[PDB]
Symmetry: D2
């Protein structure tokens, strides 16, 4: 239990999906964001008409920067 | 408070770093987890001796499975 | 020389840099192409106005399709 | 007659699958290798007993090193 601590993923009542994870390393977090943005970006290229995908990818881009700028 | 709502990342005392994001699609979440697992794996390949890295990657494997089972 | 056989990367007069690899698995090749497009996509996201990047990404998309069609 | 030039993928009798690509940036090639290594590593984690997978991943690591030194 203490080893897992977090890492929760579920369906929200608002109609969204909630994911809450943790990492004892800044590199792991940065790599995690980097991993998802790359896949996300690929989806955007496959679906140029997908605004939500672009905004989502942009959110990851912002998140990656946020984590990078995080102490 | 109806713009971002989620997508929070900060340093936790017991978890080091806490990331709480959201996605309006299960496919997006699945792709996101896949990205982090990929990077994690690359780290494990470089650090086969890193148990925590394997446990982290394993957590992503579990998370991916969890998201798959999610509605 | 037969030790490596393939897996070569150098400067090509016709393409600047040439990457030549091999894989005895259909999945490995598909995963390889998917890996590069994923990274390439991230570059396109960072440089949306980069036509050559978009074209490059398209080249990967085409390459992936070519590999998909391959027996 | 030769509009493709590069970006070739086919079945080689000497290597099963032959892939030859080009990029005007060394970074792109490095990222390309990184992409395949990431996916490959994930497969290695899924199949730790797969020597060819580990060797393949190592081939990517070696290629990554080669590209890193490549000016």
């Amino acid at each position: 239990d203490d080893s897992a601590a977090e890492w929760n993923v579920s369906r929200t009542p608002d109609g969204d999906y909630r994911l809450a994870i943790t990492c004892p390393n800044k590199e792991w977090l940065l790599q995690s964001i980097e991993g998802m943005i790359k896949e996300a970006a690929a989806e955007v290229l496959r679906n140029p008409n997908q605004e939500n995908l672009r905004r989502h990818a942009n959110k990851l881009l912002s998140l990656k920067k946020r984590a990078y700028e995080l102490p």
